[PDB]
Each structure stands twice: as structure tokens, then as C-alpha cells.
Ligand SMILES: CC(=O)SCCNC(=O)CCNC(=O)[C@H](O)C(C)(C)COP(=O)(O)OP(=O)(O)OC[C@H]1O[C@@H](n2cnc3c(N)ncnc32)[C@H](O)[C@@H]1OP(=O)(O)O
């Protein structure tokens with residue numbers, strides 16, 4: 059609340075950020091401090107005009123599309139005229155000739171491994187530590203702790219060990235072992251013990267013994283060969299470890315002394331500066347940069363009271379190899395960082411360069427410079443840098459969200475190239491995970507990949523943002539279907555398949571990930587285990603999970619599905635055509651009964667209010683919010699973008715009135731208040747709605763949603779959160 063900036067060329071840097079970089083981030087990188095700030099100045103000055111121009115192009119194209127629809131209120135749908143219009147204005151560009159990506163220096167977790175990808179807010183060090191440590195997770199804990207095992211018929215969890223439930227957990231895991239690492243002519247249900255003989259696993263049974271059906275799945279062990287403490291296996295590139303301890307509580311109940319089954323699961327994790335965090339000023343950005351620093355130095359630590367212990371990063375895992383010697387496996391998830399996209403500025407730095415009268419600096423430019431600087435530590439194993447490293451191949455991994463078309467991808471790659479120059483890194487060190495989550499990227503996806511052909515390490519269908527962009531782009535065309543019906547549309551099915559087809563045709567298999575989206579129903583893990591197998595069956599080598607527990611459970615899908623075999627079968631197929639993508643999800647006439655309209659409005663208002671109140675009042679960018687059906691949903695800015703754009707579209711076309719929307723907000727706010735009543739830090743919105751900055755922010759997101767650029771929620775959220783911060787101070 060006290061302005062204090064340091065001059066650095068044309069820049070005026072908030073002292074908290076200046077000091078953080080100079081005293082915490084720079085030492086150990088061998089980068090001269092004066093040269094670094096001179097580089098920040100030069101990059102910001104050189105690249106800001108193109109950043110501004112790209113955003114202006116977004117606005118110009120949207121205005122042209124708006125006008126096209128308004129000229130044709132009574133004309134029938136004409137896919138040909140519409141597509142030809144989008145081509146004529148430069149929205150749809152020609153597809154390049156076939157090509158193969160050339161990205162090299164990439165880690166095995168990305169190039170040749172299929173498995174879960176975790177995402178976590180970087181401002182929460184407790185969660186970030188758990189996420190980096192989620193590469194290895196207990197299957198017993200994940201089954202015991204979720205509804206994958208029913209609690210009915212005396213199988214309640216409690217807070218201790220209910221043996222009725224524990225026996226069901228053991229049985230479920232025995233079946234998983236039979237399915238994934240089968241014995242020759244036997245079931246693990248009949249195991250009485252384990253031994254290593256002549257470098258191969260021997261499983262003792264009731265009166266005989268058995269080998270693995272494929273002895274090559276044996277990867278290592280701990281303890282002695284005659285009485286091992288664990289058996290390490292591998293299947294479909296992922297490790298499985300059976301822990302043996304007949305003295306443990308669980309092992310003493312087990313016919314073979316088995317205590318747990320550990321799955322390698324969150325092979326990679328995205329440390330998120332974007333949609334799951336609330337960071338609106340220098341203080342917030344420094345908190346995130348400091349946690350990213352602790353992860354890359356390896357020394358991040360957090361005291362956790364649950365008793366109190368000190369959470370730290372896991373060491374690598376060591377085993378005796380089958381034929382002797384020492385096997386070392388990575389103990390931690392390979393880390394990406396998701397920077398913010400091209401839209402927002404942040405006043406952590408203001409620039410006077412070239413006419414700018416102290417203009418806040420583009421935040422995506424700052425993220426590339428600062429998260430790139432900090433990532434140098436993850437490449438070095440020294441006392442000055444910390445001994446724990448991230449990449450084993452010399453790369454830095456940045457997810458770049460919310461890009462619109464190939465010029466915007468080219469800009470990201472030029473930004474990374476310029477940052478590499480400032481940091482003294484080899485050209486190409488900074489790799490890019492491209493989110494396919496905006497319509498102008500989907501429709502030009504081949505060209506987007508080509509613009510990053512030597513840097514790209516994944517594409518991923520960010521289907522939630524993509525649905526928000528779908529609604530905003532065609533805002534003027536007519537009222538859209540309810541948001542729960544979007545999953546059944548022609549456009550979304552083509553969007554998912556075209557992503558996979560385009561990535562495979564660009565040579566992604568064996569070089570880069572093809573990824574799919576987040577499971578949002580945080581408590582419905584039985585449903586996740588049933589349904590989310592569709593993503594690996596679709597040829598995605600990774601997909602997003604909301605927690606370490608969900609990562610462990612989703613890992614089972616990669617043992618059931620041979621994703622790389624699926625990709626081989628998909629090669630050469632073109633399963634979609636352009637007019638499918640251009641099929642706007644408009645509602646039919648007389649689509650809804652009044653009660654259906656009411657449910658959609660109330661559900662959207664409840665989920666908006668439940669997310670926004672914690673964003674504005676507590677700076678929490680990701681919350682579990684029960685919807686109108688009492689399903690607990692992960693909410694972040696992308697889910698908010700959908701709900702607010704849908705209501706804005708229904709207002710635009712007179713499905714509801716502004717009075718209806720305000721009435722729904724007033725109806726749902728006290729229900730949100732009641733859901734949060736247990737939280738001692740909660741500030742109720744009701745009854746004085748207009749005195750709550752959080753309530754007013756939710757109202758703005760709806761009533762002014764049609765005016766937000768591409769439907770983005772950050773302009774309002776950032777303005778209102780800064781208002782609350784200044785008021786609370
Ligand atoms: C469309 C998109 O952009 S999706 C990508 C952005 N989405 C994300 O990043 C999802 C992040 N997930 C989260 O923040 C959480 O899972 C939430 C908010 C949904 C639920 O968490 P909460 O309501 O705070 O409490 P909950 O009891 O369910 O979980 C807390 C426990 O689970 C752990 N945990 C929960 N989520 C995560 C996570 N993403 N990563 C690591 N650990 C996690 C916590 O460390 C904690 O355990 P601990 O006591 O040992 O520290």
C-alpha cells in the first residue's frame with residue numbers, strides 16, 4: 059500500500075520485486091545484475107508494441123464477426139459464406155504443408171512416457187510441495203480415501219483403519235496387479251511371499267511358486283534377495299512397487315505380507331501462475347516467483363500442522379537392480395511452469411519507454427524473464443544452486459496459455475529467444491507447451507505448431523477456456539445451448555479429434571505430449587475411474603488431474619490402455635473437417651421450459667459467486683464449489699469464463715433480463731454464504747449485497763461480460779481484487 063519503485067533504465071520496478079530478483083533469484087546463475095535489468099528493459103521496450111498490436115488484432119477480428127452476424131439476423135445459416143468470410147478477413151489462414159517437429163533436448167517424461175499430468179497453484183507452497191512429490195503415490199491410500207471403494211455394508215473410512223474397508227482395498231489392488239503385471243498361471247491373491255533368484259522374481263504360492271508371465275517387467279527390489287522389502291515392476295513405461303512388511307499393520311493382515319502398492323503417477327506437474335491463482339500486484343507475483351524458486355533450487359519447505367511436521371521435496375529412489383547394482387529413479391514430478399498469456403499488464407513494473415507515462419508492463423513478458431531466470435537453478439546440481447534438479451536434458455518447460463493463432467505463437471517463441479539472450483542460455487532451451495484453447499488457434503492449429511516447431515513439447519485441449527471463447531466469438535449469432543450440453547456438440551468432438559490428428563501428423567509421437575483436459579468433479583473418483591479412460595483411449599499421452607490422489611487413480615488407466623499403440627493405429631487418419639469446427643452451438647427455437655432456464659441461471663450464478671467470493675476476499679484462485687446439484691466442482695478462471703459468457707449471451711438475446719440475473723444473484727448469494735459459514739475468515743455477501751466488492755465483481759462479470767475482450771475474466775477480477783486489498787488495508 060506504499061509505493062516504492064527503483065529506477066532501472068526506462069523501468070520503475072517495485073522494490074519488493076527488485077530485491078527478490080537481486081537477493082534471491084540471481085545469486086548462483088552467474089548473471090551480472092546490471093546486465094540482467096538492462097536486458098529486462100530492452101526486452102520490454104522492444105516487444106511491447108507487437109504485444110499491443112496482437113491484442114488490437116483480436117479486438118478488430120471480433121468486431122468484424124460481431125457485425126457479420128448483426129447483418130444477417132433473418133438470413134439462414136450459410137456455412138460456405140461464413141467460412142469464406144472468415145478466410146477473407148484473415149481469421150482462417152491456409153494450412154501449411156505437412157512437416158515434422160524438431161524439438162530436442164526433451165526429458166523422457168514428455169517424449170516417451172504416457173501418464174497423468176498434475177496442475178497446482180504456485181502461490182500455495184503446501185500444495186506445490188505435495189504436487190512435486192506426487193510422482194509416487196500410494197494406491198492403497200487413494201482407494202481407501204475415495205469412493206472408488208463404496209463405504210456401504212460396513213466399509214466406512216473413519217479416521218483409522220477399518221479392516222472391512224481395508225480388505226476391499228487389498229482385493230482391488232490384487233486385481234490391478236493380476237491385470238497389469240500377471241503371473242504365469244497364478245493370481246497374486248494366492249501369493250505367500252516374494253524372492254529374487256538368478257535375477258528374476260519368484261512369487262511363492264500355497265504349495266508351488268510362479269514367475270512373471272513376462273519376466274522383463276521386473277525392474278528392481280529393496281532388502282535382501284531372499285527376503286525383499288519391496289518389489290519394483292514396470293508396465294507401459296510406468297513403475298509399480300509392492301511394499302512388503304509382515305510386521306506393519308496392513309501387512310500383518312495380508313497373506314503375503316504386502317503393506318501397499320505404490321504407483322508412479324504424476325510424471326509431470328504444471329506449477330501454475332495463471333488460471334488457478336490470484337496475483338494482482340508485485341507482492342502476489344513475488345510470492346509465486348519465490349515458490350517457483352524453492353522448487354528449482356530444491357530447498358522449498360513448509361511447516362504443515364495436521365501435530366506439526368516440515369514438508370520437503372522427496373529424494374530420488376534407489377533400488378537393487380534385478381541382476382545386482384544400484385538403480386536410481388527420479389523421486390519428483392518433472393516440472394512445467396504455466397506463465398500467463400498475452401493479455402494482462404501488471405504494475406509490479408511500470409515503463410516510461412517511448413511515450414508510456416508509467417504504463418504497467420505486460421505480465422506475460424515479465425513471467426518469461428523471471429520464471430526463466432529462476433528455472434536456471436533447476437538445471438544445476440551445486441551447493442550454490444541446491445542439489446535437486448528438474449530437467450535431466452537441459453530444458454526449461456513453459457506452458458503458454460490463451461494464444462490466438464500462429465502470429466501469437468511466433469511472438470511467444472521470439473519472446474523466449476530474447477529471454478534466452480538475456481539469461482545467457484543456449485537458443486532453444488525454453489520449450490513451450492501450447493494450450494489449444496481459443497478458436498483461432500483450433501482453426502489454425504497446424505500453422506500454430508509450425509510456428510513453434512523447434513520448441514513445442516505439448517499441445518493440450520484446454521476445453522473449458524475453449525468453450526468460453528466459443529461463446530464469446532459467436533456472441534451476436536444467437537442464444538447458445540446450456541453449458542452442460544456443450545459436451546455433445548459437433549464443434550467440441552471435432553476439436554478434440556483434430557488436436558490429436560494434427561499433433562500425430564506433425565510427428566508428436568515419441569517427441570512431445572498430446573494432452574487432454576481436467577477432471578473437475580474432485581470427489582467423484584469412482585466416476586473418474588470409469589469415464590476418464592476415454593482420454594488415453596483417444597490417443598492422449600497425458601491428461602490433467604486435480605490432485606495427487608486423482609493422479610494415482612488416473613495412472614491405472616495407462617496400465618489398462620497402451621496409448622502408444624493407440625497412436626500408431628491413428629496415424630494417417632483425418633477424422634474431422636473444417637465446417638464441423640465452424641458449427642456454432644446455437645440453441646434451437648423454443649428450446650427450454652421456464653424451469654430449465656431457471657436452473658441454468660441459478661446454477662451459473664451459484665458457481666460464479668462461490669468462486670468469485672474467495673477470489674476477491676481471500677485471493678484464492680482455485681476453489682471447490684458445490685453446484686446446484688451439490689456436486690463439488692473445481693472452479694478456476696476457465697470455468698468462470700464459461701458461466702459468465704453463457705449468462706451474458708442469454709442476456710444479449712433476451713432469454714433473461716438484467717432483473718432476472720440480479721434476482722438470481724441475490725437468491726444464490728446467501729446459499730454461498732451458508733456453504734462457507736464454517737470458515738472463520740469468510741465475509742458474508744448477504745444481506746447488503748451492494749456493500750460486498752465480491753458480489754459486485756460477480757455482477758460485473760455477468761452484466762458486462764459481453765464487453766470483456768474474448769470474454770476474459772482477469773480485467774474485472776484484478777480490478778476488484780485490487781479494490782478490496784486497498785480497502786482492507
Ligand atoms: C481449466 C484449467 O485451467 S484446470 C488447471 C488449473 N486447475 C488446478 O490447478 C487445480 C488445483 N487444485 C486445487 O487447488 C485443489 O485440488 C482444490 C482447490 C480443487 C481442492 O482443494 P481444497 O478444497 O483446498 O482441499 P482438499 O481437502 O480437497 O485437498 C487438500 C489436500 O489435498 C492436497 N492437494 C489438493 N490439491 C492438490 C494439488 N493440485 N496438488 C498437490 N496437492 C493437492 C493438498 O496438499 C492437501 O493435502 P495436505 O493436507 O497434505 O497439504
Ligand SMILES: [Mg+2]
Nearest residue numbers: 495520523696
Ligand atoms: Mg485454460
